[PDB]
Write a protein that binds this ligand. Structure first.
Ligand SMILES: O=C(O[C@@H]1O[C@H](C(=O)O)[C@@H](O)[C@H](O)[C@H]1O)c1c[nH]c2cc(F)c(-c3ccc([C@@H]4CCCCO4)cc3)c(F)c12
Ligand SMILES: Nc1ncnc2c1ncn2[C@@H]1O[C@H](COP(=O)(O)OP(=O)(O)O)[C@@H](O)[C@H]1O
Ligand SMILES: Nc1ncnc2c1ncn2[C@@H]1O[C@H](COP(=O)(O)O)[C@@H](O)[C@H]1O
Ligand SMILES: Nc1ncnc2c1ncn2[C@@H]1O[C@H](COP(=O)(O)O)[C@@H](O)[C@H]1O
Ligand SMILES: [Cl-]
Ligand SMILES: [Cl-]
Ligand SMILES: [Cl-]
Lengths: 278, 159, 362
């Protein structure tokens, strides 16, 4: 499984014809998030004209961050979001802390790609050709796993996933609060739990762009359930081959490791699956 | 292998040359052209023609006049003359057009992955396309091919 | 007293091709026959086709398809260039259709599949044999099509159109007779459509002694379909002989066509472009020239409407190239087209264009 990734090049996973949205750092940050939505893309590489290079990437995490760092109330505009450039914000976001651009060559191996993702603790890896300097594609866990699962011809015994101090929210929890958890915990999804420890839904980093999409971000006081109105479990006594099959079959980013009485016991992410297979 | 061609009429035409100790070699006629192909060692060779009782040289071809007044043709069979690409390299020394309809066939306008796109006709690759400037922000786009795959990159740029 | 090249003794002239004489060659020892194309170096340089031939050889030497004449070897001499190729005893498909009449539905389809297979192989190799006619389709002992004169052929290059008007007026596409710009495969498709009619009918779809009416007829896309023609092949012909290249059949559409598919053997097979202005072409070119210099960019004026411009990167200290071209759209509008020239390159191209656009008309 692991030696298979070491042989296959990043190119072999680049599609026949794809779309790549690139933002200039001087672009207004609000327009930049609206562009992710309009284009139907989840991340975009950032180009600094003065630097003449790709400085970084704009993801939904950036939206989550702006929202939480600057939400005053429902009665008050987020001035920073409405009138901030991508650089004016990246200057704030990362100041005393500096996180340089992570990238991969198309001729580099899939193993090197899986490593780069976990090593730098990331979900989007841009594939840049060295001679052209052009960003070709953006490598995601889902696509790399879908490739491994294409060539594949218990969860308690192997112990894969996070099972301790699981960050989740109540039904009534406001979006702002949940946003704050996404920030301090740095986890992709927050399972929505009922009065009792059982799970009724799941608010993920993705469900946060619906606010950009619907232009509803100016109210983060709304409960997570009200927020999810616009629109999957796995038990410990199940084989990893089946659990891997489930994720790609449903095309989901992580499964909920729940007990018999539908009460959360842990989470197993695509991150962890590809990592354990490296 | 060198070609020896005599353009011009004749009943009988021969080739005498340094390469064959000036012996009369008969040249075959197809029509108006009398020819013989023979490999000659790389270097200088002198030849003359025996065209129907007269000793002549091809005046179109380089000559050499002897200290004795003998006027023969000359040939420099170069190494370069033997290899095709070497020989071809040594050899190489209004109103605006109408818009082809092809350039109006995009892949961005014409359930499914928004990332994925149709394959383009080679003819529209590297061409710049742009959206109307709305909100004082320009949007530029183009499809480029990297090996056997394609990438349509769109830049969001202020102005 | 035999004229030899390779170990083949040169004989009878089969014909006179685009750039040379074609003679038979029968091997000294084996009796094997080859077709030898003789290209005099002085003549191939007099017509400035030396580059054409260099490329033509390059392509054909690596090609290998059962319905494209094989180029065995190229023998160079100080005088001339000898292109040793596969010989086929059956001669022209044209004389076949002259001698015997039109081919039967079955026989026609076979030969059409064979030709189209070859036509496709060329296109799949960014080669477009323009001048595709029964006269250039040879037949072997066993009745197999063989595509032959690549003298008029051209390369298909990413982002660029061809201009050369090439073949026989009959087989020539309307845009070729109109002398308009074209991609390449569509004009081979049209010629192949004319070939299909020639096979089924034994006559030419568009043909007239009065050249002007021949050109009207071609550009009107009107041809007669004799009653004996199967409506399905009429369907295919109507699709292949579309005056609009955008509405014309593709090797894909033909391959999918019911008539074609039949008994087919296994072995074969709001975005806006640039910027548009309603000004005078010369005023437009002047404006764009005084705009390029206003950016301190190097350039080279090719056509009075083509310009190849260069820019030095103020950061990476790298040279970036692009080409600008004015095309006519309406009878009242024109549009300037920007194309990237390949040696981030793409973003640098966008930047280069963007600058020019802000200081320009619509
Ligand atoms: O013919 C040629 O050029 C044409 O000359 C015309 C002219 O001057 O009248 C012009 O009008 C035309 O445009 C021009 O293409 C050649 C150019 N290089 C050549 C090299 C060659 F080897 C032969 C050749 C080979 C074998 C035999 C044998 C002889 C015996 C019979 C079987 O053929 C005869 C001759 C050639 F014919 C040529
Ligand atoms: N290639 C990269 N190099 C460096 N930082 C990156 C890169 N891609 C994204 N980032 C940063 O990583 C952080 C989190 O992003 P990410 O995990 O990719 O979000 P998502 O789960 O929506 O894919 C953000 O601060 C973002 O700017
Ligand atoms: N709600 C959650 N609570 C705790 N850990 C989580 C949660 N969701 C994901 N993780 C873990 O976060 C890590 C990175 O995964 P992810 O951000 O979900 O792609 C993995 O070790 C996951 O198991
Ligand atoms: N374990 C899960 N069960 C059900 N839906 C899920 C799960 N994880 C993610 N989703 C859904 O996937 C979408 C968000 O995608 P993402 O963050 O990329 O996984 C939302 O509509 C979520 O409700
Ligand atoms: Cl002929
Ligand atoms: Cl014989
Ligand atoms: Cl034969």
């Amino acid at each position: 499984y692991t030696t298979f990734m070491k042989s296959h090049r990043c190119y072999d996973l680049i599609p026949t014809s794809s779309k790549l949205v690139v933002f200039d750092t001087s672009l207004q940050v609000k327009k930049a998030f609206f562009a992710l939505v309009t284009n139907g893309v989840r991340a975009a590489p950032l180009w600094d004209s003065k630097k003449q290079s790709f400085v970084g990437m704009l993801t939904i995490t950036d939206f989550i961050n702006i929202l939480h760092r600057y939400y005053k109330s429902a009665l008050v505009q987020i001035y920073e979001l409405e009138e901030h450039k991508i650089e004016t914000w990246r200057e704030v976001y990362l100041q005393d802390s500096f996180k340089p651009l992570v990238c991969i060559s198309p001729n580099a191996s899939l193993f090197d790609a899986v490593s780069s993702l976990i090593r730098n603790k990331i979900h989007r890896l841009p594939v840049i050709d060295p001679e052209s300097g052009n960003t070709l594609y953006i490598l995601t866990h889902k696509r790399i796993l879908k490739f491994l699962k294409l060539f594949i011809t218990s969860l308690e015994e192997l112990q894969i996933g996070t099972y301790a101090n699981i960050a989740m929210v109540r039904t009534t929890t406001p979006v702002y609060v949940a946003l704050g958890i996404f920030v301090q915990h740095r986890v992709s999804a927050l399972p929505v739990v009922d009065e009792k420890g059982r799970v009724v839904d799941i608010y993920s980093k993705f469900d946060v762009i619906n606010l950009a999409a619907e232009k509803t971000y100016n109210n983060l006081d709304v409960s997570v359930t009200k927020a999810l109105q616009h629109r999957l479990k796995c038990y410990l006594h199940e084989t990893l081959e089946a659990i891997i099959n489930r994720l790609v079959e449903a095309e989901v980013h992580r499964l909920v490791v729940v007990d018999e009485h539908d009460v959360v016991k842990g989470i197993v992410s695509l991150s962890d699956i590809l990592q354990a297979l490296v | 292998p060198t070609v020896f061609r005599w353009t011009g009429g004749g009943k009988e035409v021969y080739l005498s040359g340094s390469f064959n100790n000036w012996s009369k070699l008969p040249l075959t006629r197809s029509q108006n052209n009398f020819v013989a192909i023979l490999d000659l060692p790389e270097g200088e060779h002198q030849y003359k023609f025996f065209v129907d009782g007269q000793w002549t040289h091809d005046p179109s071809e380089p000559i050499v006049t002897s200290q004795l007044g003998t006027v023969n043709n000359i040939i420099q069979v170069k190494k370069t003359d033997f290899e095709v690409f070497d020989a071809l390299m040594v050899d190489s020394q209004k109103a605006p057009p109408i818009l082809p309809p092809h350039l109006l066939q995009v892949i961005l306008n014409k359930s499914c992955d928004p990332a994925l796109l149709p394959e383009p006709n080679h003819v529209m690759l590297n061409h710049l396309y742009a959206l109307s400037i709305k909100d004082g922000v320009m949007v530029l786009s183009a499809t480029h091919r990297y090996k056997k795959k394609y990438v349509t990159t769109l830049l969001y740029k202020p102005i | 007293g035999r004229v030899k090249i390779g170990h083949y003794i040169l004989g009878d002239t089969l014909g006179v091709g685009t750039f040379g004489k074609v003679k038979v060659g029968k091997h000294e020892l084996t009796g094997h026959k080859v077709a030898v194309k003789i290209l005099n170096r002085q003549k191939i340089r007099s017509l400035d086709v030396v580059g054409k031939i260099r490329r033509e050889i390059q392509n054909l030497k690596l090609f290998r398809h059962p319905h494209i004449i094989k180029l065995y070897q190229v023998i160079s001499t100080p005088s001339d260039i000898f292109m040793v190729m596969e010989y086929v005893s059956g001669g022209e498909l044209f004389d076949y259709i002259c001698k015997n009449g039109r081919l039967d539905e079955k026989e026609s389809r076979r030969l059409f599949q064979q030709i189209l297979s070859g036509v496709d192989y060329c296109h799949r190799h960014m080669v477009v044999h323009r001048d595709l006619k029964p006269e250039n389709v040879l037949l072997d002992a066993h009745m197999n099509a063989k595509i032959a004169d690549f003298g008029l052929s051209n390369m298909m290059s990413d982002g660029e159109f061809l201009r050369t008007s090439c073949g026989s007026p009959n087989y020539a596409a309307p845009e070729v007779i109109s002398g308009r710009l074209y991609a390449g495969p569509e004009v081979d498709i049209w010629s192949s459509g004319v070939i299909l009619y020639a096979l089924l009918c034994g006559t030419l779809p568009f043909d007239d002694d009065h050249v002007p009416t021949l050109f009207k007829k071609i550009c009107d896309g009107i041809f007669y379909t004799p009653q004996y023609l199967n409506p399905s092949v009429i369907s295919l012909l109507k699709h292949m002989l579309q005056v609009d290249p955008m509405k014309r059949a593709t090797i894909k559409d033909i391959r999918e066509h019911e008539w074609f598919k039949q008994d087919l053997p296994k072995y074969l097979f709001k975005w806006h472009l640039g910027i548009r202005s309603q000004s005078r072409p010369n005023d437009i070119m002047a404006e764009v020239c005084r705009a390029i210099k206003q950016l301190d960019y190097e350039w080279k004026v090719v056509n009075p409407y083509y310009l190849r411009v260069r820019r030095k990167n103020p950061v990476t200290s790298t040279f970036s190239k692009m080409s600008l071209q004015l095309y006519q759209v309406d009878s009242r509008t024109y549009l300037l087209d920007f194309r990237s020239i390949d040696d981030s390159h793409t973003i640098e191209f966008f930047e280069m264009c963007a600058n020019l656009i802000k200081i320009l008309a619509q």
